[PDB]
Write a protein that binds this ligand. Structure first.
Ligand SMILES: CSCC[C@H](N)P(=O)(O)O
Ligand SMILES: [Co+2]
Ligand SMILES: [Co+2]
Ligand code: NA
Length: 262
């Protein structure tokens, strides 16, 4: 079932959350044309282990071979870092990090634009982030998760894009992927009322083209069926008494860390 975090649990999540956020802040300068994704993965891993004294939740999870997930352009999610995959001007890339500290998980991701952005690329990233922010602003006790997925969907579709159905947000804590499943679209199947102390991620994947996706033979990599660009952003949050707190907020986020309702 859905686990409710204690205040002590929450304090541990703030640390793990901030650690994950920090890897993203740190890597930025390395994201440039000509760098390989395998190299970004090594830099991230070194930092996590050697400086942070933490651990990557990804390494070995169901056999996942690397420390972070790096998805370029049409890759939806779960792209596997590789020494052979070099970044080019105009690429949009997602770096998804999940760190474990004192047994608690922190899961977050953001898009990076390599070199000179393309119009589509910039637009897609922006809209994707806005859709995540919109959802964040709605979080509060008593509301049904269904409403959030529906708002994201309506927003995204209104902008001419599509939302991926298959992958979604999830509870997180001592476990990497806990209940509940956080859908990024409107579904009659969803019936979950939020309560304070719940911790979960929101991580909408938006496609410039059609919603359909396909899983690669590697068993992890996900791509759009039509090869259109896909973007994603992710934050880990905790439901509070009058709103929410964003555990993985970064210096470049433009949303406040604590959102209060009244
Ligand atoms: C190789 S497991 C990686 C899982 C991602 N952090 P997420 O739970 O955001 O999809
Ligand atoms: Co993630
Ligand atoms: Co996640
Ligand atoms: Na992508």
């Amino acid at each position: 079932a859905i686990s409710i975090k204690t205040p002590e649990d929450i304090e541990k999540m703030r640390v793990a959350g901030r650690l994950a956020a920090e890897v993203l802040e740190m890597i930025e300068p390395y994201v440039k044309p000509g760098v390989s994704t395998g190299e970004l993965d090594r830099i991230c891993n070194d930092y996590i282990v050697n400086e942070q004294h933490a651990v990557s939740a990804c390494l070995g999870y169901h056999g996942y071979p690397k420390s972070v997930c790096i998805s370029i352009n049409e890759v939806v999610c779960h792209g596997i870092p590789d020494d052979a995959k070099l970044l080019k001007d105009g690429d949009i890339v997602n770096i998804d990090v999940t760190v474990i500290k004192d047994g608690f998980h922190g899961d977050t991701s953001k898009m990076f634009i390599v070199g000179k952005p393309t119009i589509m690329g910039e637009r897609l990233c922006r809209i994707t982030q806005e859709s995540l922010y919109l959802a964040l602003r709605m979080v509060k006790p008593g509301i049904n998760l269904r409403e959030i997925g529906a708002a994201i969907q309506k927003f995204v579709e209104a902008e001419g894009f599509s939302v991926v159905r298959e992958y979604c947000g999830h509870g997180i804590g001592q476990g990497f992927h806990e209940e509940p499943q956080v859908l990024h679209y409107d579904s009659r199947e969803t019936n979950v009322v939020l309560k304070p102390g719940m911790t979960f991620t929101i991580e909408p994947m938006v496609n410039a083209g059609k919603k359909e996706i396909r899983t690669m033979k590697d068993g992890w990599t996900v791509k759009t069926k039509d090869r259109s660009l896909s973007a994603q952003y992710e934050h880990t949050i905790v439901v509070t008494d009058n709103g929410c707190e964003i555990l993985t907020l970064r210096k470049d986020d433009t949303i406040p860390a604590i959102i209060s309702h009244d």
